[PDB]
Amino acid sequence: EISCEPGKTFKDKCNTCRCGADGKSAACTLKACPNQ
Protein backbone atom coordinates (compact mmCIF):
# COMPACT_ATOMS: atom_id res chain seq x y z
CA GLU A 1 0.00 0.00 0.00
CA ILE A 2 1.10 3.65 0.32
CA SER A 3 3.21 5.24 -2.40
CA CYS A 4 5.64 8.15 -2.87
CA GLU A 5 9.08 9.15 -4.15
CA PRO A 6 11.30 6.28 -3.03
CA GLY A 7 14.38 7.59 -1.20
CA LYS A 8 12.55 10.81 -0.26
CA THR A 9 10.89 11.90 2.98
CA PHE A 10 7.68 13.74 3.87
CA LYS A 11 5.07 14.20 6.61
CA ASP A 12 2.19 11.88 5.62
CA LYS A 13 0.67 11.08 9.05
CA CYS A 14 0.64 13.81 11.73
CA ASN A 15 4.31 13.16 12.52
CA THR A 16 7.10 12.57 9.97
CA CYS A 17 7.63 9.75 7.48
CA ARG A 18 10.40 8.82 5.04
CA CYS A 19 9.31 7.27 1.72
CA GLY A 20 11.32 4.01 1.62
CA ALA A 21 13.43 2.93 -1.39
CA ASP A 22 10.14 1.56 -2.72
CA GLY A 23 7.34 3.85 -3.96
CA LYS A 24 4.82 2.21 -1.59
CA SER A 25 6.02 2.85 1.95
CA ALA A 26 8.02 5.19 4.21
CA ALA A 27 9.64 4.71 7.64
CA CYS A 28 8.02 7.24 9.94
CA THR A 29 8.31 8.74 13.41
CA LEU A 30 5.78 9.77 16.06
CA LYS A 31 5.17 12.82 18.25
CA ALA A 32 2.45 15.45 18.83
CA CYS A 33 0.18 15.89 15.78
CA PRO A 34 0.49 19.53 14.68
CA ASN A 35 -2.75 20.89 13.16
CA GLN A 36 -3.50 24.53 14.09
Q: What is the distance between the alpha carbons of residues 31 and 14, in angstroms, rounded to a whole number?
A: 8
Instruction: Of 15, 35, 2, give the one whose Cα is nearest residue 26.
Output: 2
Measured distance CA(1)–CA(26) in Å, rounded: 10
Whole-angstrom CA distances from 6 to 1, 12, 21, 24 are: 13, 14, 4, 8
Method by which this entry was solved: NMR
Please report, for residues 19, 30, 32, 35, the alpha-carbon distance to residue 13 in angstroms, rounded to integers and kept in the order given.
12, 9, 11, 11
Strand partners, 16: 29
Asked if 3 contacts 24 with a C-beta cutoff of 8 angstroms, the reply is: yes
